[PDB]
Amino acid sequence: MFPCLHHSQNLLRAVSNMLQKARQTLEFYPCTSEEIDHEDITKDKTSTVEACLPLELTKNESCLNSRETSFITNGSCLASRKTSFMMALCLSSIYEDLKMYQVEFKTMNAKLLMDPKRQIFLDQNMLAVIDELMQALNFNSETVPQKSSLEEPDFYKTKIKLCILLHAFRIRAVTIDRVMSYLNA
Amino acid sequence: RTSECCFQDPPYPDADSGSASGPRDLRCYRISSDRYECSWQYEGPTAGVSHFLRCCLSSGRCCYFAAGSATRLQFSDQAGVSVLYTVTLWVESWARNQTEKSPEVTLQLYN
Amino acid sequence: DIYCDYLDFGINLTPESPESNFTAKVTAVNSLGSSSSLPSTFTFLDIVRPLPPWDIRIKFQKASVSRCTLYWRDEGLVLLNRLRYRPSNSRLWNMVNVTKAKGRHDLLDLKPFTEYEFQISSKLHLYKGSWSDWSESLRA
Amino acid sequence: AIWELKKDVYVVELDWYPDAPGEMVVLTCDTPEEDGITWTLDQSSEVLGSGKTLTIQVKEFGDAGQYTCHKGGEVLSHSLLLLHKKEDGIWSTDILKDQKEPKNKTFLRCEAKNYSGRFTCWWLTTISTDLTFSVKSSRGSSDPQGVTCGAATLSAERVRGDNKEYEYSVECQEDSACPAAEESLPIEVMVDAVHKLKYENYTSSFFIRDIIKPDPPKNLQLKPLKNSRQVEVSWEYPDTWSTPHSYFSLTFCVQVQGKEKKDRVFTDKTSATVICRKNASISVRAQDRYYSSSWSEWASVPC
Numbered sequence: 001m002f003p004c005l006h007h008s009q010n011l012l013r014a015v016s017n018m019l020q021k022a023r024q025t026l027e028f029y030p031c032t033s034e035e036i037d038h039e040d041i042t043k044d045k046t047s048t049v050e051a052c053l054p055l056e057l058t059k060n061e062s063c064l065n066s067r068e069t070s071f072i073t074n075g076s077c078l079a080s081r082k083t084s085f086m087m088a089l090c091l092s093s094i095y096e097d098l099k100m101y102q103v104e105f106k107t108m109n110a111k112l113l114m115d116p117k118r119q120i121f122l123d124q125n126m127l128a129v130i131d132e133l134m135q136a137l138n139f140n141s142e143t144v145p146q147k148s149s150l151e152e153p154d155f156y157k158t159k160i161k162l163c164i165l166l167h168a169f170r171i172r173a174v175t176i177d178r179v180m181s182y183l184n185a
Numbered sequence: 186r187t188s189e190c191c192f193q194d195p196p197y198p199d200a201d202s203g204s205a206s207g208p209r210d211l212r213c214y215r216i217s218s219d220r221y222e223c224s225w226q227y228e229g230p231t232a233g234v235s236h237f238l239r240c241c242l243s244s245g246r247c248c249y250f251a252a253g254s255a256t257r258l259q260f261s262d263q264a265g266v267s268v269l270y271t272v273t274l275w276v277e278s279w280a281r282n283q284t285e286k287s288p289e290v291t292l293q294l295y296n
Numbered sequence: 297d298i299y300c301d302y303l304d305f306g307i308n309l310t311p312e313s314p315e316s317n318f319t320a321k322v323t324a325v326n327s328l329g330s331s332s333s334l335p336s337t338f339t340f341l342d343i344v345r346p347l348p349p350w351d352i353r354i355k356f357q358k359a360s361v362s363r364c365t366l367y368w369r370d371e372g373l374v375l376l377n378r379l380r381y382r383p384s385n386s387r388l389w390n391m392v393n394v395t396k397a398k399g400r401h402d403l404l405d406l407k408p409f410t411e412y413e414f415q416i417s418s419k420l421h422l423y424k425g426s427w428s429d430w431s432e433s434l435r436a
Numbered sequence: 437a438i439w440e441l442k443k444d445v446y447v448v449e450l451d452w453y454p455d456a457p458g459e460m461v462v463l464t465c466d467t468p469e470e471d472g473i474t475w476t477l478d479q480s481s482e483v484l485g486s487g488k489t490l491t492i493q494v495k496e497f498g499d500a501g502q503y504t505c506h507k508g509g510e511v512l513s514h515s516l517l518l519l520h521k522k523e524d525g526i527w528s529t530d531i532l533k534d535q536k537e538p539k540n541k542t543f544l545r546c547e548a549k550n551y552s553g554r555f556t557c558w559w560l561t562t563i564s565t566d567l568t569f570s571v572k573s574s575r576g577s578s579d580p581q582g583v584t585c586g587a588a589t590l591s592a593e594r595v596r597g598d599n600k601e602y603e604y605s606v607e608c609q610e611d612s613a614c615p616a617a618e619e620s621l622p623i624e625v626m627v628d629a630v631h632k633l634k635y636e637n638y639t640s641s642f643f644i645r646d647i648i649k650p651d652p653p654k655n656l657q658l659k660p661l662k663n664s665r666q667v668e669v670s671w672e673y674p675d676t677w678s679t680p681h682s683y684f685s686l687t688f689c690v691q692v693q694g695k696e697k698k699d700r701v702f703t704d705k706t707s708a709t710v711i712c713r714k715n716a717s718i719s720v721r722a723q724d725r726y727y728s729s730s731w732s733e734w735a736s737v738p739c
């Protein structure tokens with residue numbers, strides 16, 4: 001049993017439940033996988049797409065581009081002398097992916113609360129799981145400050161952006177789960 | 186020549202009207218965007234009756250389809266018959282060694 | 297527990313002298329009968345196994361010259377050591393012993409800059425100490 | 437408009453309504469200049485036009501075919517003509533048939549069995565002869581020579597109704613050397629169906645994970661527990677499925693209904709224990725554990 005793998009399995013399950021709630025709440029807003037384009041915020045910032053691979057799959061090492069964002073932050077999920085750099089860079093990039101998403105999700109939630117009705121709001125449990133996993137991934141975890149606005153934003157745009165992020169995040173959550181399973185075995 | 190119209194003149198030497206019994210009710214309809222069907226009824230029956238659908242394009246290059254004892258034929262856009270411009274269609278049957286002609290009908294054929 | 301891979305003594309053993317004799321025995325008891333293992337006497341050096349050197353650094357003698365200096369770090373009480381100078385493409389031979397230096401100096405290394413795997417091991421005692429596991433390979 | 441599908445082949449786009457005027461079509465020959473070039477459409481020596489240039493509006497299919505560039509008694513060049521019918525402003529789709537299983541207007545159905553990127557696409561067409569297919573593929577549009585599609589082959593000749601639909605399939609492998617954990621661009625496959633003088637094209641976009649269909653579980657065996665009614669059943673991962681088996685995982689659903697309506701049990705473990713009625717079979721199915729995927733074929737062992 002791997003504790004980070006348990007957190008990652010909790011993350012994928014939490015996103016799956018939130019995604020189901022989002023489809024039910026926003027009946028008109030189009031939130032089916034077919035009608036929602038895949039857009040990834042972390043497209044160029046992080047190297048999870050390349051660094052997070054089984055050791056057998058990655059060989060030439062040429063594609064790792066000049067140790068891109070090679071922070072290699074030390075953390076409680078692995079041990080400093082336990083695994084190869086290929087997994088050390090991957091764990092740092094996964095931490096960065098969760099930081100980029102959590103900062104955005106909190107911004108969306110703060111705008112959603114202002115709605116006169118409560119049609120939809122991001123799951124507090126899902127946000128807590130993202131923070132718990134980041135704390136294990138990197139010791140120098142930064143907790144996002146409470147975000148708020150002094151004005152009211154258009155709600156339709158936030159609800160379309162929300163659906164686009166949730167689906168992309170779910171794909172990211174499976175990718176983290178596969179890496180955690182590989183680390184355990 | 187294979188399931189497609191032949192521009193060459195029909196083999197039988199004489200097309201002279203043969204007898205009171207004649208093919209009748211020649212009608213062509215569009216089964217599908219590229220499928221079509223023409224139906225003709227022969228008044229007098231024969232064990233060896235052979236049915237031929239001879240048509241003529243606006244150009245006047247009349248051509249004859251080949252069929253064997255059938256009241257119906259199905260053809261596609263590239264049989265040779267024009268399926269956008271005007272095109273006459275008529276039926277001839279060689280039974281008893283006399284060739285009778287169904288009344289000629291001109292149909293757009295796109296409907 | 298009915299099946300035990302091993303039993304661990306929480307207390308660390310500090311040996312009054314490096315040459316001491318400590319004896320260990322295991323007893324198995326069941327409703328039907330009891331079997332006890334023969335006493336085995338172990339000196340402290342036999343029980344201790346040095347940790348693989350955690351640190352590694354490659355420097356070409358602060359120059360473009362072929363000679364290479366390797367700056368590693370490990371447990372303080374090591375009186376011996378061994379280094380892998382084998383070419384990365386084909387393993388050849390690794391020196392049996394290195395001097396008692398944390399930082400290798402004037403090691404013979406190939407003139408090309410092609411990536412070379414590096415592995416390091418240390419021996420706590422030459423006379424009766426187990427070799428440490430090879431350190432994580434260092435690429436180039 | 438007139439565009440060249442390939443050298444010596446020119447597809448012409450024509451509107452399809454009754455009494456339609458044709459596009460002015462110009463024929464040119466890339467040969468040393470000859471005074472008196474003649475031009476034929478049919479194999480017959482009827483001569484259509486003279487000069488290195490021939491003008492002929494393609495008002496109907498009869499006016500499309502292999503125009504021949506011949507002078508001096510030698511055929512200088514060749515000018516095959518292909519037609520892309522457009523009906524009510526909508527491109528014609530006659531060569532292939534709408535399966536409709538995923539949704540309407542679906543003529544291409546693709547599948548995969550591994551994360552390697554090897555995939556096969558099946559298209560059902562009812563045209564017996566004179567049929568050719570051109571297949572090209574790429575990841576998004578950025579990868580040049582991204583995918584190496586193979587050549588169409590007839591696969592089956594079933595008799596649905598009386599039409600006898602024939603199924604043609606292509607084998608395509610992602611030729612990208614760099615391994616990547618997640619896909620950001622959908623693979624796009626284009627089939628340029630050609631029949632006689634008629635040209636049609638079909639485009640399908642998809643992701644490998646979505647089209648993945650696992651092969652049936654391997655080495656299924658039943659081992660009865662000693663002195664117990666239940667029987668332990670053990671199965672193994674398919675060799676074809678991508679490795680390692682830790683990063684890529686499958687979920688096994690076991691149904692014991694054989695021949696009570698639903699004995700299906702979903703077990704991640706490779707061995708499950710099920711009471712075995714003497715008069716039934718035990719069957720196992722495999723699906724991607726991580727994402728929703730097409731279910732595998734049932735693997736049945738007699739019990």
Ligand SMILES: *[C@@H]1O[C@H](CO)[C@@H](O[C@@H]2O[C@H](CO)[C@@H](O[C@@H]3O[C@H](CO)[C@@H](O)[C@H](O)[C@@H]3O)[C@H](O)[C@H]2NC(C)=O)[C@H](O)[C@H]1NC(C)=O
Pocket residue numbers: 437438439440447449520626628637
């Ligand atoms: C699928 O079939 C359609 C039907 O022809 C193709 O669209 C046509 O594509 C050709 C090739 O690009 C176009 O011809 C040429 O286009 C270029 C670029 O605009 C231009 O420089 C040339 O002068 C000529 O126009 C043609 O215009 C276009 N037809 C329409 C109505 O846009 C399409 O390419 C086919 N796709 C595949 C993958 O085969």
Ligand SMILES: *[C@@H]1O[C@H](CO)[C@@H](O)[C@H](O)[C@H]1NC(C)=O
Pocket residue numbers: 315316317
């Ligand atoms: C330990 O035992 C060995 C043999 O029994 C003996 O040679 C050695 O001197 C002993 N060591 C001590 C410290 O008594």
